[PDB]
Symmetry: C2
Subunit: 259 residues, 2 copies
């Protein structure tokens, strides 16, 4: 059975990773992918590869869907990985990036991991036990109406009218700049909601479980329910401000650029 043992294994792999990264930084190399803002490093690739390796060693039946490798891909043990979510923050700030890891058994979220390596905070989620930040149990956050909550989203990728209407309806706006971590601030009850209008499946894979066990909302921007295997325009939200955010997003002909 237990997830609990697989979790001990995963957590001991993270301890391993913690000692590997300073080396990977030491010889850091930087490339761009499709455009000058789409960055990859040796850090991103080596973490992925090392889990690909871990998985082969201890879990050869298990498959891996992940950002820095091709995928293809009805699957029984699936891991989803963003080896460095927030690569732009790694490169420019050496701060505010994370590892995102999530395990799915017959489509159902079983374990989930967001590792804030720079602050040495490991958020984890385990079906049957709960969500934890470095061992302390995380509890359902207090209700947050939109009008009292801080929100996070990319303003660059939306028309300014609906950016305005979000500004007007919320307490304030902030942005960390990594899905995993803005999402975690919603979990921790510090942001009311996080939006990403075009995530990949690895950008959001761990959030399903956190959301389930901490009583958050996680949907498409049409309220629907997200296929973990493909992305979708998504939101993670306090329960008390979810409907309101989506309503504003879909108003006046939608959030899309131009207009």
């Amino acid at each position: 059975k237990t997830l609990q043992q697989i979790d001990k294994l995963i957590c001991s792999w993270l301890k391993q990773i913690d000692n590997v990264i300073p080396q990977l930084i030491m010889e850091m190399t930087t490339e761009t992918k499709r455009h000058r803002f789409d960055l990859v490093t040796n850090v991103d690739k080596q973490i992925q590869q090392q889990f690909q390796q871990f998985l082969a060693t201890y879990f050869p039946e298990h498959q891996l869907l992940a950002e820095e490798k091709s995928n293809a891909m009805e699957i029984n043990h699936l891991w989803i990985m963003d080896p460095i979510d927030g690569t732009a923050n790694l490169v420019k700030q050496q701060e505010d990036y994370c590892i995102i890891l999530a395990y799915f058994y017959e489509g159902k979220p079983m374990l989930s991991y967001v590792y804030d390596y720079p602050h040495k905070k490991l958020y984890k989620a385990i079906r049957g036990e709960g969500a934890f930040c470095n061992g302390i149990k995380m509890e359902e956050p207090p209700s947050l109406k939109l009008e009292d909550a801080i929100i996070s989203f990319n303003a660059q990728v939306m028309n300014l009218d609906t950016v305005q209407d979000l500004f007007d309806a919320s307490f304030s706006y902030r942005l960390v700049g990594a899905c995993g971590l803005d999402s975690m601030r919603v979990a921790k009850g510090q942001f009311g909601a996080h939006i990403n209008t075009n995530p990949k499946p690895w950008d959001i894979a761990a959030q399903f479980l956190f959301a389930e066990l901490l009583n958050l909302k996680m949907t498409t921007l049409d309220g629907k329910a997200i296929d973990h295997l493909k992305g979708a325009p998504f939101i993670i939200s306090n329960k008390a401000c979810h409907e309101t955010v989506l309503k504003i997003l879909n108003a006046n002909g939608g959030y899309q650029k131009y207009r």
Copy 2:
């Protein structure tokens, strides 16, 4: 008294407020000021009170210009001046318990001699001592690498500018992030992690420390017109890497400027 003796006293009084803040947080109470979003807490108040008490107890003749008390005294002619934002980022403190800081700057006859931005939630004390340099927990900071704007993240408040100039800043910049406390957003510029941070209406206490960080680490710190800033008064302000400063100002001042109405 040797600044190193004064600094020893301050770092130490900042260090001890660690023991105090947790309990003040667990009894957090909140009042409003200019309007319902202009927040102040038991935390802001007690840290200021406890500093003023410290200053009376240790440098009787010095003076405190600070956020949560009136500053009618002054004016240009005071020898020993401290300026303090007891909690900068009060909104963040209330909502997140993270990304707030304490600002202090000592000025001897107008000239900044010591500066402190204490990032309490991650326990990172930033300090700058004239003659010594700038430090983060005693790890020494040096001038950052040149950052052109299109290679740089910027930080600013997108809600108080007209959405065209906002768009223009996005467009010309690598990306946008916001921490939401001036002192911390400023420090990211100081560390070279952001190319620049803008605040279009700071008070003296939101920017008091940064003068010296900027001088010692070769940053540009100016009004949104390029001129010197008078530390007794606010101005619309920027603090920047040297390579992106002119460009950010050009963008701000174009097509009637950065105000909602141009």
